[PDB]
Amino acid sequence: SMNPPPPETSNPNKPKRQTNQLQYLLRVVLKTLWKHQFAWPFQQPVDAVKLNLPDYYKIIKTPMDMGTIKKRLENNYYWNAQECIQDFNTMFTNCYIYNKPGDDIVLMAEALEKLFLQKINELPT
Numbered sequence: 001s002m003n004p005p006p007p008e009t010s011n012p013n014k015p016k017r018q019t020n021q022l023q024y025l026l027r028v029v030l031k032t033l034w035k036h037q038f039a040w041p042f043q044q045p046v047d048a049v050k051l052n053l054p055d056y057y058k059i060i061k062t063p064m065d066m067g068t069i070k071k072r073l074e075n076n077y078y079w080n081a082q083e084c085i086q087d088f089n090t091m092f093t094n095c096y097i098y099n100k101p102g103d104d105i106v107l108m109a110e111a112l113e114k115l116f117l118q119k120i121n122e123l124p125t
């Protein structure tokens with residue numbers, strides 16, 4: 001099987017805007033995660049062909065990655081911050097679903113998730 005197309009990062013039918021919370025998600029949250037030592041597996045869509053994972057997209061039907069989130073934020077694709085937060089959570093949950101508790105990649109995802117929640121909490125009122 002080929003890889004599926006990546007998640008859309010623009011959509012001419014979907015209203016878009018820029019908000020302070022969305023700017024924070026790009027300039028602080030995504031920036032912080034992107035530079036983390038464990039970011040690399042999450043910086044692009046899972047290439048199931050290259051990784052020899054013929055069953056990845058049989059199991060994961062809602063793929064998401066930080067490369068896609070980054071482009072979405074840069075493109076002002078979202079209407080609200082909870083949409084973007086959901087994309088991060090989808091990415092983490094996918095990792096937990098495909099893999100098993102305690103796996104190397106699961107620990108990496110858990111570390112990133114902890115940091116993500118810290119940065120979200122730090123959003124100034």
Ligand SMILES: COc1cc(C(=O)N2CCC(N3CCN(C)CC3)CC2)ccc1Nc1ncc2c(n1)N(C1CCC1)c1ccccc1C(=O)N2C
Pocket residue numbers: 040041042045046047051053094095098099104105
């Ligand atoms: C760019 O994408 C990758 C590069 C390489 C790689 O060959 N690399 C890593 C970078 C480079 N490093 C050199 C040393 N420096 C310090 C860091 C970079 C050495 C060369 C390997 C895998 C990559 N992609 C990837 N993307 C998502 C994954 C994943 N892999 N894994 C792997 C289990 C652990 C990761 C999985 C394996 C099986 C089933 C599921 C997953 C999974 O859930 N996720 C999230």
